[PDB]
Design a protein around this ligand. Sequence first.
Ligand SMILES: COC(=O)[C@@](C)(O)C(=O)[C@]1(C)C(C)=C[C@H]2[C@]3(C)CCC(=O)C(C)(C)[C@H]3C(=O)[C@@H](O)[C@]2(C)[C@H]1C(=O)O
Ligand SMILES: COC(=O)[C@@](C)(O)C(=O)[C@]1(C)C(C)=C[C@H]2[C@]3(C)CCC(=O)C(C)(C)[C@H]3C(=O)[C@@H](O)[C@]2(C)[C@H]1C(=O)O
Ligand SMILES: [Ca+2]
Ligand SMILES: [Ca+2]
Ligand SMILES: [Ca+2]
Lengths: 140, 140
Amino acid sequence: PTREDLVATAKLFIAKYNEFTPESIISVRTPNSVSHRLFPTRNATRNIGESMEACANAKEVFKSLTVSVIDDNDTIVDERTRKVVFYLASRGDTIVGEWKSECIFIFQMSEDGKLVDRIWAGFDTAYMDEFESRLDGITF
Amino acid sequence: PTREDLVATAKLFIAKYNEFTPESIISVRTPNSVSHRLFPTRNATRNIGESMEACANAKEVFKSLTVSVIDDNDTIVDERTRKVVFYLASRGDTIVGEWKSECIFIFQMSEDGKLVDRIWAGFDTAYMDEFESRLDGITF
Ligand SMILES: COC(=O)[C@@](C)(O)C(=O)[C@]1(C)C(C)=C[C@H]2[C@]3(C)CCC(=O)C(C)(C)[C@H]3C(=O)[C@@H](O)[C@]2(C)[C@H]1C(=O)O
Ligand SMILES: COC(=O)[C@@](C)(O)C(=O)[C@]1(C)C(C)=C[C@H]2[C@]3(C)CCC(=O)C(C)(C)[C@H]3C(=O)[C@@H](O)[C@]2(C)[C@H]1C(=O)O
Ligand SMILES: [Ca+2]
Ligand SMILES: [Ca+2]
Ligand SMILES: [Ca+2]
């Protein structure tokens, strides 16, 4: 797969991610793919089934959620390891107020370049902690 | 510059980073180089002079620092943009005890591949907040 092939798959992943349904967030992934969350305070690993479960749980909190590659000039592509790095803006509305953050996604594509075989995601963990404290403070 | 050229310069940057003096942390950088932070919550941008001063400040807290590539197999190299990505463990001896975290470093090398022209660093921002809370607890 060419540099452009790898980026196109990563951009398709993002397109389907922004549909934000359990069906759509798996639709550009290999079935044995795992999704890693970077940094010790938020470290986690999710297979396809756990990813769909996480998406459905997020949908209980997020009324909407969109991510966008901020600048294609930031994008990093390693043709030899079939990896693409995006730096993304994430934006949404939730039951505890606005979500606004940025994150780094690393994709490793399948051998044919057409699917995401592994994901690593680096979030703003302090922001996640603040958001969780808003969730943890729900009262009626 | 080849793939091996780029990794070598990045690895030299890390070695001199771990020496952790104001001169050593700029020794592998171009004169106009800029260091960026990823993530809104600890967003900072520093030129050479600002990086030296920040090192001197940090040395008041960090007695010793070691960042190390966790897995060379995870390293990302983009020959076209001259970029290298490391996922690093960070380990520190500080005035409030042990520092232990992980971070992602992105380097963009100069045209000849011998210096670091631009740096982006993604830290565990929740852990940075936890550490500052430890610092703010110093009691005589
Ligand atoms: C961590 O990588 C991911 O985003 C994916 C590829 O693993 C996901 O499919 C998951 C299920 C999806 C759809 C969304 C994220 C978020 C809700 C996206 C918005 C966010 O920035 C936050 C940090 C709130 C995300 C998460 O909490 C993510 O852990 C999930 C739920 C994500 C997952 O796999 O962890
Ligand atoms: C990404 O770190 C860098 O490249 C720079 C330009 O920000 C730096 O030179 C500084 C001076 C250096 C040497 C170290 C960092 C750290 C102490 C590295 C270890 C860390 O994990 C932490 C997060 C505690 C770092 C920081 O706090 C950084 O602010 C500094 C001290 C960094 C700087 O301030 O610029
Ligand atoms: Ca639920
Ligand atoms: Ca909680
Ligand atoms: Ca303080």
